[PDB]
Ligand SMILES: Nc1ncnc2c1ncn2[C@@H]1O[C@H](COP(=O)(O)OP(=O)(O)OC[C@H]2O[C@H](O)[C@H](O)[C@@H]2O)[C@@H](O)[C@H]1O
Ligand SMILES: NC(=O)c1ccc(O)cc1
Ligand SMILES: [Cl-]
């Protein structure tokens with residue numbers, strides 16, 4: 408926990424100039440249009456615009472600890488609103504342009520945004536989710552589960568069991584949830600486009616999953632303010648705020664970003680909603 412490798416913290420941010428950013432976001436739109444199977448990979452950078460600090464950014468949790476300072480939260484986890492980026496991802500799944508979503512985030516925001524749980528891998532856990540040790544039944548709570556490291560919360564299973572409820576928050580030594588990793592790995596390998604949003608890709612195996620898309624000629628897009636571990640393997644790197652990238656992308660795809668009605672849990676994805684006809688590309 409103390410000796411745990413926290414990776415490269417507080418690397419300088421990169422800002423693509425406006426003409427370059429507009430061009431790269433048009434190229435991302437072209438890639439989404441051309442791809443059969445698009446998989447999104449999200450980390451802490453997609454929640455910074457809701458007041459949750461990241462880990463390895465200039466003011467990240469690990470970066471500030473390294474400098475003897477404290478990360479700053481501008482929200483509780485319960486009061487945090489899904490970002491433009493979170494709601495863009497909801498819409499992209501709804502209209503059938505997102506096959507699967509792989510997240511390292513424990514902030515509960517993809518679930519709370521109404522994103523379907525059967526198309527989401529929560530590789531590091533969810534602070535609002537507790538799981539029965541006996542029957543594996545998950546409970547998605549309206550408040551953060553008060554423990555971390557897969558400890559007993561003090562609550563019991565209510566399935567028609569009285570099993571011990573435990574948090575789903577991995578500690579450093581804990582292996583990833585087998586179901587979530589297996590589905591994330593399958594999605595990434597089968598994808599012809601992986602798009603990374605606000606992750607430095609430094610954690611194994613989470614950070615390596617986007618590389619799996621590159622096997623069999625798949626394309627990799629990295630959207631991140633800082634360098635990432637796998638920048639060399641990216642067909643496209645966009646250095647800008649993930650909300651600016653995603654609002655511009657949605658505008659190019661002819662999609663609105665849906666309203667957030669407050670915390671809502673969706674277990675299963677629906678058939679795709681209607682979406683705009685595709686442009687002629689070549
Ligand atoms: N608004 C933004 N727009 C674009 N990029 C952003 C923004 N905000 C931050 N970034 C970038 O977003 C990136 C986030 O990188 P990291 O902070 O390493 O977060 P992770 O999710 O990959 O951390 C993985 C695990 O490591 C931990 O131990 C936990 O277990 C995590 O689950 C940074 O490079 C920022 O430049
Ligand atoms: N619980 C935490 O310390 C924490 C910090 C930042 C995040 O983005 C998520 C969780
Ligand atoms: Cl922490």
Ligand SMILES: [Cl-]
Pocket residue numbers: 482483484485551
């Ligand atoms: Cl909180």
Ligand SMILES: [Zn+2]
Pocket residue numbers: 539540541542543544564565566568569570
């Ligand atoms: Zn149970």
